[PDB]
Amino acid sequence: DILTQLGVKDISKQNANKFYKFAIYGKFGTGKTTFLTKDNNALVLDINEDGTTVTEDGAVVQIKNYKHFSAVIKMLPKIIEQLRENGKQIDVVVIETIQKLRDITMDDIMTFNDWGECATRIVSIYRYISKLQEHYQFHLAISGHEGTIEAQDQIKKAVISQSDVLARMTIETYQYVLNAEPSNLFETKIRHSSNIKINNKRFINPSINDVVQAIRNGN
Amino acid sequence: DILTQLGVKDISKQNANKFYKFAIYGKFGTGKTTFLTKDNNALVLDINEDGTTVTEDGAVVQIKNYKHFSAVIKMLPKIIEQLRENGKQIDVVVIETIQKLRDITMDDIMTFNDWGECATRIVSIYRYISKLQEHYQFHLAISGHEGTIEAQDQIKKAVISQSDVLARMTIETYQYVLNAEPSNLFETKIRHSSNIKINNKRFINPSINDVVQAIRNGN
Amino acid sequence: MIRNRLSELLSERGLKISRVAKDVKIARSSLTSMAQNDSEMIRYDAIDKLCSYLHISPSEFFEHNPINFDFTFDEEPNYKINDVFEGFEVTANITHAFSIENFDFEILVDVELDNRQKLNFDLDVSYKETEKITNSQHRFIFTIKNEDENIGLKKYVDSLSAGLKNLLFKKINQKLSGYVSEIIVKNIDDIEELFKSTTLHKEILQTDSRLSSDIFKE
Amino acid sequence: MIRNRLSELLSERGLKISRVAKDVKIARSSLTSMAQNDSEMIRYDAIDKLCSYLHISPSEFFEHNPINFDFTFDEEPNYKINDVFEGFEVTANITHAFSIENFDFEILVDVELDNRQKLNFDLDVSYKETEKITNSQHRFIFTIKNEDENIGLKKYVDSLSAGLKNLLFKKINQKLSGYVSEIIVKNIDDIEELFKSTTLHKEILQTDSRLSSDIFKE
Numbered sequence: 007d008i009l010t011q012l013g014v015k016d017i018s019k020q021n022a023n024k025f026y027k028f029a030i031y032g033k034f035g036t037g038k039t040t041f042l043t044k045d046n047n048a049l050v051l052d053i054n055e056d057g058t059t060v061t062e063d064g065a066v067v068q069i070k071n072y073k074h075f076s077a078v079i080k081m082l083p084k085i086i087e088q089l090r091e092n093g094k095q096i097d098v099v100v101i102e103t104i105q106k107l108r109d110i111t112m113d114d115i116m117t118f119n120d121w122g123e124c125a126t127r128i129v130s131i132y133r134y135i136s137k138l139q140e141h142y143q144f145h146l147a148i149s150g151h152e153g154t155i156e157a158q159d160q161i162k163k164a165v166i167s168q169s170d171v172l173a174r175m176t177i178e179t180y181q182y183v184l185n186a187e188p189s190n191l192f193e194t195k196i197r198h199s200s201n202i203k204i205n206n207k208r209f210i211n212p213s214i215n216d217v218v219q220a221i222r223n224g225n
Numbered sequence: 226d227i228l229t230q231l232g233v234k235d236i237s238k239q240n241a242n243k244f245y246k247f248a249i250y251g252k253f254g255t256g257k258t259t260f261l262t263k264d265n266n267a268l269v270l271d272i273n274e275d276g277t278t279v280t281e282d283g284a285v286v287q288i289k290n291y292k293h294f295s296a297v298i299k300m301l302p303k304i305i306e307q308l309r310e311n312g313k314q315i316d317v318v319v320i321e322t323i324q325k326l327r328d329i330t331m332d333d334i335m336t337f338n339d340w341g342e343c344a345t346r347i348v349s350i351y352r353y354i355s356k357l358q359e360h361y362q363f364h365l366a367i368s369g370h371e372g373t374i375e376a377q378d379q380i381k382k383a384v385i386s387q388s389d390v391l392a393r394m395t396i397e398t399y400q401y402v403l404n405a406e407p408s409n410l411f412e413t414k415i416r417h418s419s420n421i422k423i424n425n426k427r428f429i430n431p432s433i434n435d436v437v438q439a440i441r442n443g444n
Numbered sequence: 445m446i447r448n449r450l451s452e453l454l455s456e457r458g459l460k461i462s463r464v465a466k467d468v469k470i471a472r473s474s475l476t477s478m479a480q481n482d483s484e485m486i487r488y489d490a491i492d493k494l495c496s497y498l499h500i501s502p503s504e505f506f507e508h509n510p511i512n513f514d515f516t517f518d519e520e521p522n523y524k525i526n527d528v529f530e531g532f533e534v535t536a537n538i539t540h541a542f543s544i545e546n547f548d549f550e551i552l553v554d555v556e557l558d559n560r561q562k563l564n565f566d567l568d569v570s571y572k573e574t575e576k577i578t579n580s581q582h583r584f585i586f587t588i589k590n591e592d593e594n595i596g597l598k599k600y601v602d603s604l605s606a607g608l609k610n611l612l613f614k615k616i617n618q619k620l621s622g623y624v625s626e627i628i629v630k631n632i633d634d635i636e637e638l639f640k641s642t643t644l645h646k647e648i649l650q651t652d653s654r655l656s657s658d659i660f661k662e
Numbered sequence: 663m664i665r666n667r668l669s670e671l672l673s674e675r676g677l678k679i680s681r682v683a684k685d686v687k688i689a690r691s692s693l694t695s696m697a698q699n700d701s702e703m704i705r706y707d708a709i710d711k712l713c714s715y716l717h718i719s720p721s722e723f724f725e726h727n728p729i730n731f732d733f734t735f736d737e738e739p740n741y742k743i744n745d746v747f748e749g750f751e752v753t754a755n756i757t758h759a760f761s762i763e764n765f766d767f768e769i770l771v772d773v774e775l776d777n778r779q780k781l782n783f784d785l786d787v788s789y790k791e792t793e794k795i796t797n798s799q800h801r802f803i804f805t806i807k808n809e810d811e812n813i814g815l816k817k818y819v820d821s822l823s824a825g826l827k828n829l830l831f832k833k834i835n836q837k838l839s840g841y842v843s844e845i846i847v848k849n850i851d852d853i854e855e856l857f858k859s860t861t862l863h864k865e866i867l868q869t870d871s872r873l874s875s876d877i878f879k880e
């Protein structure tokens with residue numbers, strides 16, 4: 007089959023159960039982490055930080071070194087299967103901070119040559135995670151701090167391009183809502199098929215499931 | 226066990242008895258130290274100051290030099306065991322002033338290179354205290370002076386990110402109340418699980434216990 | 445056909461290679477290789493030291509059978525290999541790197557009897573599938589196309605003792621694995637992994653191919 | 663087997679090491695090393711000065727026994743070590759830095775009798791657990807797998823005098839600790855502490871491993 011010999015594949019079947027990636031930049035003290043772990047079915051790879059206190063339930067692993075980070079990503083297939091074995095439910099793998107990934111990769115490589123290598127490390131990680139993402143049915147989510155998400159463009163470009171849904175989480179008693187509605191002031195994008203229509207792009211008390219259901223089924 | 230090989234651990238069990246860190250920034254004469262030591266079960270590592278008079282009972286250790294500071298932190302495990310052996314109850318370790326930590330670390334390192342090293346010292350301290358924090362079941366609390374808490378962002382960023390609860394204490398007959406309700410004018414954040422709801426984010430005559438109970442059990 | 449019987453003799457007595465080597469003053473690596481039939485030559489000194497040490501006559505050390513087999517592989521095989529792409533670089537699964545559409549060739553075997561008379565049997569072997577022995581390793585499986593015409597070859601093979609038969613099967617497989625692996629490595633270019641490093645060619649050489657056929661049952 | 667008896671003789675007479683060194687004009691460091699059986703060579707001058715000083719014949723200074731033991735460790739051991747991470751850098755607890763999944767190997771012992779005849783015993787030793795002797799220090803514990811086959815070795819060991827037996831046990835342990843420590847240091851990279859500095863490799867070398875088995879009871 008010349009079709010099979012090349013990578014050509016049908017879209018209707020590919021978009022049916024696809025696991026979307028989610029990037030959430032919620033500034034400070036808003037609930038973007040709560041959002042990621044609200045489902046209580048999450049594995050949090052936090053970096054030099056411990057924000058697991060907010061999560062109701064799930065799995066978690068402190069990352070203290072770039073070497074430690076490389077090991078967990080390489081053995082991630084083996085790890086996820088056993089949590090499912092122990093009976094723990096993992097549907098999403100979360101990296102707590104993109105800025106810390108910049109800091110750790112920089113230490114490993116320690117100029118624009120250095121910055122380009124740092125970008126190369128970041129792009130390589132996403133490609134590796136994605137091939138496993140299709141294999142193990144795990145949603146990926148990365149979170150960062152407002153300062154658009156704060157970082158150097160080469161990274162921002164790569165993150166925004168690859169990310170399916172990019173959202174900004176803000177608090178408006180007080181109501182906490184995730185607003186992905188288009189806007190010049192802040193940049194957001196949700197990907198849905200032509201037939202699917204999002205009547206409301208702001209979600210109050212949001213969870214990864216609710217977003218998934220909105221992007222697969224009618225809002 | 227591939228799960229055990231890596232640091233991956235369950236969340237429901239991790240958030241059950243977690244000892245939260247508390248950062249309380251206040252203006253002059255707002256009785257911020259009273260709150261931390263009201264429980265009368267506290268060890269105060271005051272820096273170049275003596276505010277133990279407001280406290281009724283507990284153990285206080287004056288810190289006069291960066292070298293003295295390094296020693297107490299390194300031997301802190303051994304110390305906690307002895308005060309508990311003497312029967313003194315220590316549940317919280319308090320550093321009186323973050324600005325003094327900036328001043329002492331600066332003397333030890335004496336440019337942006339100097340500032341970055343000062344930030345490196347501050348981040349390293351928290352990581353060290355945290356691993357003991359899980360081991361010895363001690364709440365950590367740091368306090369500073371309003372001028373948001375006054376400091377240089379690199380420090381502020383690290384403190385706010387790591388701190389579980391950040392609160393501002395103000396006096397409003399006159400009443401002393403800690404307000405962590407969200408607000409553009411002042412920045413506050415309390416971390417609680419989705420199911421837990423804080424009906425009232427302002428606490429009058431506050432103590433560390435009351436906050437702990439509010440963040441674990443229903444407000 | 446001839447093989448050393450050292451591995452069996454030591455097992456019945458229970459002496460380990462580590463000890464025997466210390467006493468007979470023969471280096472462990474050489475004694476281990478000679479324990480297997482891998483070595484091609486044996487030094488007269490080794491035959492006597494061991495024979496005196498285990499009170500075994502030279503007869504016992506060697507097993508002989510007058511039969512003798514020869515295998516020749518076609519210089520020109522028919523092979524078609526299609527690159528699969530699919531980012532093999534991330535996960536080291538050979539199947540992603542390349543796929544064999546069809547690889548078929550002939551192996552000529554001459555079973556020389558004890559008498560001068562010899563019999564000629566011609567085997568045609570073709571690719572069937574690539575089995576996954578373990579997650580990280582695979583074994584190409586090749587099946588003989590014509591077996592009914594060469595049924596007589598099987599009668600000569602099973603006549604050998606079990607130890608000789610296991611040796612012969614290792615020899616036919618080692619050659620096959622070298623033949624197929626060498627052909628593939630040339631047609632497909634190497635791909636180095638992003639994250640020590642295992643290039644595609646090294647993985648292909650490591651890969652082993654074992655013939656699956658009625659004639660050979662072990 | 664042979665050891666100096668200086669430590670016992672001085673204790674009975676009650677003389678301190680410092681006074682003896684000042685009188686016999688031998689440097690304290692050398693006399694202390696020789697008090698232990700650590701030194702390999704002894705100068706004739708030392709044997710006479712001490713023997714004249716303590717009115718002891720040369721016979722008394724040395725204890726001898728015709729028995730002689732030899733130990734050989736496998737060149738190729740089977741070892742699996744898994745990095746544990748968990749921020750060892752903060753608290754110096756080796757367990758956090760690395761964990762041994764399984765480390766097993768063989769030690770070959772030859773008990774040569776007074777007569778030319780020698781007996782060969784083969785010991786297989788495996789990892790069991792890492793005991794914590796003190797909060798800052800640990801001792802890897804290894805247990806002999808087969809002891810019933812090598813019961814006879816124990817009968818030869820306890821036949822020695824207590825002083826010789828204590829010496830032999832030190833020799834078997836020192837070698838084991840060097841062997842296991844050297845293997846681990848290569849597989850695991852060093853980690854330097856944040857807060858003089860104690861790197862992981864230095865801690866691993868300091869760590870000592872003591873064999874736990876019925877054969878050796880002291």
Ligand SMILES: Nc1ncnc2c1ncn2[C@@H]1O[C@H](COP(=O)(O)OP(=O)(O)OP(O)(O)=S)[C@@H](O)[C@H]1O
Nearest residue numbers: 032033034035036037038039040182211415416417
């Ligand atoms: N959907 C929500 N409804 C009401 N309050 C919420 C909601 N989400 C978050 N909060 C509040 O915010 C707290 C959690 O804030 P986090 O999730 O830690 O914020 P974040 O922005 O993800 O993280 P940092 O560390 O503050 S940048 C909760 O305990 C609530 O006080």
Ligand SMILES: Nc1ncnc2c1ncn2[C@@H]1O[C@H](COP(=O)(O)OP(=O)(O)OP(O)(O)=S)[C@@H](O)[C@H]1O
Nearest residue numbers: 166167168169170188195196197198199200202204
């Ligand atoms: N014709 C349209 N009407 C309404 N919304 C639309 C329309 N086209 C796109 N959108 C919105 O934009 C989403 C798709 O954006 P994309 O097609 O991915 O944008 P793009 O600019 O082609 O690609 P990047 O990756 O963002 S540069 C949809 O899910 C809608 O939210």
